[PDB]
Design a protein around this nucleic acid. Structure first.
Lengths: 79, 40, 77, 98, 52
DNA sequence: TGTCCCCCGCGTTTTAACCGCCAAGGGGATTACTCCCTAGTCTCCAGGCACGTGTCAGATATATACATCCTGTTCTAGAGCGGC
DNA sequence: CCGCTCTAGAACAGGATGTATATATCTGACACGTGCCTGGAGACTAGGGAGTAATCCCCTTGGCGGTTAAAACGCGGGGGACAG
């Protein structure tokens, strides 16, 4: 699996900013937003990896993702 | 290479096509739509 | 290699699981019989006005195969 | 014959209104799914994720980025602008402490 | 903190040295990001547009 | 205030997204046997805490000394003018 | 067209005031010593929760076509970020 950081397409980043009420989006925002999302994903998934490793499990469950988000003050409801 | 003014009508929606057979003259887009309507 | 080599030797059979699904349908068989129809009609129009009444013929030399297919169908029931 | 030729900004505000009252997921499923597996394979190989596990990751990442974009947009009007910049995001993360 | 104490020519660890030691290390700064240190102040850094 | 170049709206053509369908086989979930080590005491003793105190690094103090910043004066380059 | 004088930008040196240090001395907590003494450790008893083994069924990954929604490319252009 390579070049998967481009999976978050420019209209997808455009649509995300539209939900946030952004009037205009620069061309350099998409590269920065991908990097910010990559950094944020690299922290939540790594925390979920330790949660999955602690349970002697090989598949990451949704409950471990919730605990990974809860410990950083970003608790998620619905899972 | 267009029988009408060079640019199916390009740059328009699909609900404008017409393929009837009449006389065809290019005239360089009617002298570029009459010099863009005589410079506006 | 014991499981790699024989799978590598299969070229048409690897895609057969999807080729059979895509090809053993109604529209493909109708197309493949209409193609033979237009081939015969065009060839006879070129050659001779009467048209043969036989196309895409199957031979039935074995009788036990029908019972084997019935056994498979019965297992499917 | 004259094209409609909407000026920039109006359809963007229309997209803002149509996507603020809606709740469908903006990011596609498999592109976000494949990004998770590539990131996770750097930490541990032969790792699997449940379908609902990625569902929790996708909604949380979108809401975090939308909230970041809200602060990013709020920085633009604060800086007498309507176009967001990469430096606007950097200021937003620094103030939040990320 | 001992390395920071040698920088300002001090042989005793003071809360200024502990704050400087924590904030200089990126790992310690992120771990103690939401931590308030008394009598430590902040890093002596000035933004580039502020210098003449 | 302007501009121009950076970003949006739209036409076209690919493109991979989603749902439609099928197995696969690691793997989450459950049950049971059993075995280690942690719950719970007895006794004690050696490390930890309260107290007391000589002491050694920090702060106050001040002439001395940095130390960079602000400003004044002079050097040299550039444009304007006048004469040949 | 060339030389002369006027003018001004800019590098450079000197004055100024708030701090960097070199002692002198206070000084006040710092750490060492002491005397305990109160909580952890050796030893013991007992039991119970997970390691491990087995099962199972289940659920995520891989793997296909279909299709139509949408990303991507490009053209027109237009309103805004930024230099001024």
């Amino acid at each position: 699996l390579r070049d998967n950081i481009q999976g978050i397409t420019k209209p997808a980043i455009r649509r995300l900013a539209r939900r946030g009420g952004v009037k205009r989006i620069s061309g350099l925002i998409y590269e920065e937003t991908r990097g910010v999302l990559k950094v944020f994903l690299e922290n939540v998934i790594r925390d979920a990896v330790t949660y999955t490793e602690h349970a002697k499990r090989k598949t990451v469950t949704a409950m471990d993702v919730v605990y990974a988000l809860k410990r950083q003050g970003r608790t998620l409801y619905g899972f | 290479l267009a029988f009408h003014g060079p640019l199916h009508y390009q740059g328009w929606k699909s609900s404008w096509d017409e393929w009837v057979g009449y006389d065809r003259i290019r005239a360089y887009n009617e002298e570029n739509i009459a010099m863009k309507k005589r410079l506006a | 290699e014991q499981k790699v080599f024989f799978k590598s030797l299969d070229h048409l059979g690897l895609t057969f699981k999807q080729a059979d699904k895509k090809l053993l349908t109604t529209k493909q068989l109708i197309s493949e019989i209409s193609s033979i129809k237009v081939d015969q009609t065009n060839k006879k129009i070129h050659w001779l006005t009467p048209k043969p009444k036989s196309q895409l013929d199957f031979d039935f030399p074995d009788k036990n195969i029908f019972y084997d297919i019935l056994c498979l169908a019965d297992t499917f029931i | 014959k004259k094209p409609h030729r909407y000026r920039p900004g109006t359809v963007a505000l229309r997209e803002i209104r149509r996507y603020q009252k809606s709740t469908e997921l903006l990011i596609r499923k498999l592109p976000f799914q494949r990004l998770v597996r590539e990131i996770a394979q750097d930490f541990k190989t032969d790792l699997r994720f449940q379908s609902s596990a990625v569902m929790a990751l996708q909604e949380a990442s979108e809401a975090y980025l939308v909230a970041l974009f809200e602060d990013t947009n709020l920085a633009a009007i604060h800086a007498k602008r309507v176009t967001i910049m990469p430096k606007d995001i950097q200021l937003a993360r620094r103030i939040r402490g990320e | 903190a001992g390395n920071a104490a040698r920088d300002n020519k001090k042989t005793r660890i003071i809360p200024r040295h502990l704050q400087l030691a924590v904030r200089n290390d990126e790992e310690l700064n992120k771990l103690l990001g939401r931590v308030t240190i008394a009598q430590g102040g902040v890093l002596p850094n000035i933004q580039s547009v502020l210098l003449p």
